[PDB]
Amino acid sequence: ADLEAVLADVSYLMAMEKSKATPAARASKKILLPEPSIRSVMQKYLEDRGEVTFEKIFSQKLGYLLFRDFCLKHLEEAKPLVEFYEEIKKYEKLETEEERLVCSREIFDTYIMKELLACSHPFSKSAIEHVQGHLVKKQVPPDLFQPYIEEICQNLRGDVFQKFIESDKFTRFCQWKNVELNIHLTMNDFSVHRIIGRGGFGEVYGCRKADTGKMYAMKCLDKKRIKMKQGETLALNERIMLSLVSTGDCPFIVCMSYAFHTPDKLSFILDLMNGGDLHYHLSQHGVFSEPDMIFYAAEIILGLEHMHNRFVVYRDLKPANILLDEHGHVRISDLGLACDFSKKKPHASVGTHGYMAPEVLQKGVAYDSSADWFSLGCMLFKLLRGHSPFRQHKTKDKHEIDRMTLTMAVELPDSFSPELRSLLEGLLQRDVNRRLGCLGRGAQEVKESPFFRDLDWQMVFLQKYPPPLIPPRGEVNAADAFDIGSFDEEDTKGIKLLDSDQELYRNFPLTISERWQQEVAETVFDTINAETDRLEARKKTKNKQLGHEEDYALGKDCIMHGYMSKMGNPFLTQWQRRYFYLFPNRLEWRGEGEAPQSLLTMEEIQSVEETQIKERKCLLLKIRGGKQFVLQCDSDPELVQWKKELRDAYREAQQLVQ
């Protein structure tokens, strides 16, 4: 290969491998948390939608981390409870009874027996007796301590949670949540490496997120090409499907973290399966063997089960769409042609010739998730033979392959064991009502098939089995960027994107909370937290020494307060950032911090409405008498809450004054 390609590959590989032992060091940009005063607005914003309950926070990764570290360091009473809960959770992940026996005895002695002996145990007799009855019989199921989990959560829900909310670590949670809700991604935020694939409406590049360093796969769709091929509906459907299946914990599907668009591209951020697709590895390694294909079939069956449980039908199932991760475990990747059959069963012949179900290939006849099982059979057949059960592209014409609707699968006796012959005979049935997986419970009908009789599906979900193939660690595991190529830019000439077209993607951008929180927790949570803490320590010392504290008790009846930019003065600085206080009768206004002063009285307000200025969202207040004020906030949540609270305040004040 030429020098440029070699350099691109080396840069991509080094960025992928850099600082594996210290993920925090991979970030080139830094997350700047807002000031601790943010909680005055963010608390109301979260309360107004009921998000400050114990379950909501404790179920969030960052919320859980902050609550845990508060209990373990700033509340002695809650320390044993959190320690017990955490060790129970650790125990639940033990995979063998030989280890669970000792772990459970240690947990019992440490957190139950000693407290019982000291008579300090606060838990109910029921949980004690349940655990004692299970253990006296030598039973160590993973659900041993579930009653203790419930009771620990009940105890933490009490004054412990209120103390946490009143603490300075709920302020940190508010800061992190505000940082989350203000995610506005652009192509600048990512360091895009060499192209790794192409197809559909655009290309796929490996990329590193700037402010966390986590490696992602950026899938870009060109808006002009989408308009040219009338693909707006498909482009939006792909986002719907990705957001539908990403919300969860399934490790068998390429999950989406973010979605955004530039003026000309639609971009999805997905998991990076640096091992490459299974078709490339099949070509390099050759036909797999039955014990090897057991692994792939089991993993793909679990993935399809996850998708089907959500009523999504994966119409294009090929070896090319199956991506191997670093360690060799597979995932389903391309949800471009996926559809939902819960509302109405599709009827379009969408797929790839040689892997489409007979009812999919038939015109007009509706079909359901039943399609994915025929495609699974065809795919498993390819892994063992190098081609679909019906002729390949180089062996027959496209419509000659379509004669799959007028024949029956060969079902070779040589390369297949009788169990596999039965499995493929079930999966390649012409009649949907008789086809395996298309009757009864669905995924269970296949999972219980004889070919998987030896397989323990719990270990499949836990991914304990050794992959048959481990992708090379020193290669990109993809075709050369010259081979992948690029779309012809001339094809888009004559295509113009109207404002009515950019309106189709008004609501496109998206961020998934759990995925972002997990990324932050893995990468830069502790570093940022420490830096933030140092910054507030510095500023607190400065304020204490020089006076002008952060706030003088926040007044007597302040509804809310926070920074806002008094905007729009031509003869002064446009961004006159200041600190504001809201009261039921007036809105006060403070300078650098010496003394607050009144800016406005609610009785004067005529209306409050949002407006766009300098391509930035702002708040417009119109005043009885022709006066007006413009205020600009920093995070959409600040703007939303300020709008809501100002509106409610003046409406109530004027209605009462009526």
What span, in angstroms and rounded, lies between the C-alpha atoms of 493 and 487?
Answer: 12
Q: What is the DSSP string of 99-145?
A: HHHHHHHHHHIIIIIHHHHHT---S-HHHHHHHHHHHHTT---TTTT
Query: In what side-by-side order are the strands of the sheet with 560-567?
Result: 596-601, 586-590, 575-582, 560-567, 628-632, 616-623, 605-613
Whole-number Å distance between alpha carbons of 360 and 374? 10
Instruction: State which amino acid sits at residue 61.
Output: K
Residue with tokens 């060109």: 222
626 is in an annotated binding site: no
Q: Which residues pair with residue 544 across a beta bridge?
A: none
The first and second tokens of residue 533, run together, are: 């803490």
- What would the two tokens of residue 248 be? 């969860």
**Is 555 annotated as ligand-binding?**
no
| Cα dist from 112 to 120, 134, 148, whole Å | 9, 14, 10
User: Is 590 a known ligand-binding residue?
Assistant: no
The verdict on whether residue 133 carries a ligand-binding annotation is: no
Whether 421 and 410 have beta carbons less than 8 Å apart is answered as no
Give me 92's structure tokens. Answer: 């639940």
What stretches of 273-350 adopt beta strand conformation (E)? 312-313, 322-324, 330-332, 339-340
Which tokens belong to 184?
A: 């506005």
User: Is 108 assigned to a binding site?
Assistant: no
CA distance 176 to 598: 31
Q: By 3-state DSSP, what share of the chain in percent is helix, strand and coil, each rounded to 5?
A: 50, 15, 35
**The token pair that represents 636 in the structure block:** 């959409």
Does 203 carry a binding-site annotation?
A: yes
Q: Which two tokens stand for residue 486?
A: 């690029």
Dihedral of the alpha carbons of 40, 41, 46, 52, in degrees to the nearest 10: -10
Which residue numbers are catalytic?
Answer: 316
Three-class SS of residue 270? strand
CA end-to-end span of the chain, whole Å? 80
The helix/strand/coil state of 325 is: coil
Q: Is 303 annotated as a binding residue?
A: no
Binding site residue list for ATP: 196-204, 219
What residue numbers does the annotated binding site cover? Answer: 196-204, 219
